[PDB]
Design a protein around this ligand. Structure first.
Ligand SMILES: Nc1nc2c(ncn2[C@@H]2O[C@H](COP(=O)(O)OP(=O)(O)O)[C@@H](O)[C@H]2O)c(=O)[nH]1
Ligand SMILES: [Mn+2]
Ligand SMILES: [Mn+2]
Length: 269
């Protein structure tokens, strides 16, 4: 079977309890994870150890907190106490875990399931070929020996409009923001990098990225996490918002793809 779980955010106990609920069995089953494996919850170290151990039985995409962890590890960004990342950063296998993490994809595609996954979704300004190319470009910089330079370049809120003519730092920054930070769009598809509210609470003319018809969403289902204030609700057919805010005292959600059946694990916090 195929299971898709939203942002874990260091909630290792909840993750294991949810996987035991569905009797997840590597070799029979595959797990998709929407990213943000780490930060806020208490068990980021255990989460990374376990997910890495799964190998081919897991399909991960990196989220904004995964990238921020990499930036802290590389000395690019400052450690925030509230992220609770010190046990992971101080672990004896930290190098092995984080060099594995930076090699993971930003985008997962299954053509037989007609299923696409990224942390924040697929901007309506991208067709599939462009999304693939952009993911490849950023994954290439992240898996290179020079990844700290890219992590430093990644921070920024502009440009917020895609163009095939984008080059250099602006191109990489847009790609990173689209895959890992996107929530709201302007009517022309341009990213808004400030509003994190629920769709009903946001200011006009902002709309969810998934409320703007895009070529990927017309042909593929899209699963994503990231947008906790959406509470996994209010999405169109074919759009699966899996982040129900476990680290926030909400729930961890698992979707079984074959029958679209949901399983939920309450937060222990
Ligand atoms: N207004 C509102 N904000 C929320 C809610 N849940 C989370 N947030 C906020 O959203 C901000 C970004 O958190 P989140 O959506 O989990 O994404 P992440 O930071 O990438 O992991 C956090 O600082 C939370 O305070 C909610 O239910 N309502
Ligand atoms: Mn998150
Ligand atoms: Mn996120």
């Amino acid at each position: 079977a195929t299971y898709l779980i939203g942002d874990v955010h260091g909630c290792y106990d909840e993750l294991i309890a949810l996987l035991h609920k569905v009797e997840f069995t590597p070799g029979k089953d595959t797990l998709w994870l929407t990213g943000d494996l780490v930060a806020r919850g208490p068990g980021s170290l255990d989460v990374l150890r376990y997910v890495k151990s799964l190998g081919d039985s897991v399909r991960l995409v990196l989220g904004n907190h995964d990238l921020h962890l990499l930036a802290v590890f590389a000395g690019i960004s400052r450690n925030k106490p509230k992220d609770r990342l010190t046990p992971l950063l101080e672990a004896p296998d930290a190098d092995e875990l984080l060099n594995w993490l930076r090699r993971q994809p930003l985008l997962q595609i299954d053509e037989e399931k007609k299923l696409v996954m990224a942390h924040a979704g697929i901007t309506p300004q991208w067709d599939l070929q462009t999304a693939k190319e952009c993911a490849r470009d950023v994954e290439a910089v992240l898996s290179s020996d020079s990844y700290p330079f890219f992590l430093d370049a990644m921070y920024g809120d502009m440009p917020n409009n895609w163009s095939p003519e984008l080059r250099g730092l602006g191109r990489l920054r847009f790609i990173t923001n689209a895959f890992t930070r996107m929530r709201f769009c302007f009517p022309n598809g341009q990213l808004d990098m400030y509003s994190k509210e629920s769709p009903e609470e946001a200011p006009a003319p902002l709309k969810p990225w998934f409320a703007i018809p895009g070529p990927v969403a017309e042909e593929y289902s899209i699963a994503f996490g990231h947008w906790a204030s959406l509470e996994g609700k209010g999405t169109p057919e074919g759009i699966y918002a899996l982040d129900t805010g476990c680290c926030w005292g909400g729930t961890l959600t698992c979707l079984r793809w074959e029958d679209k059946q949901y399983f939920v694990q309450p937060s222990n916090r």
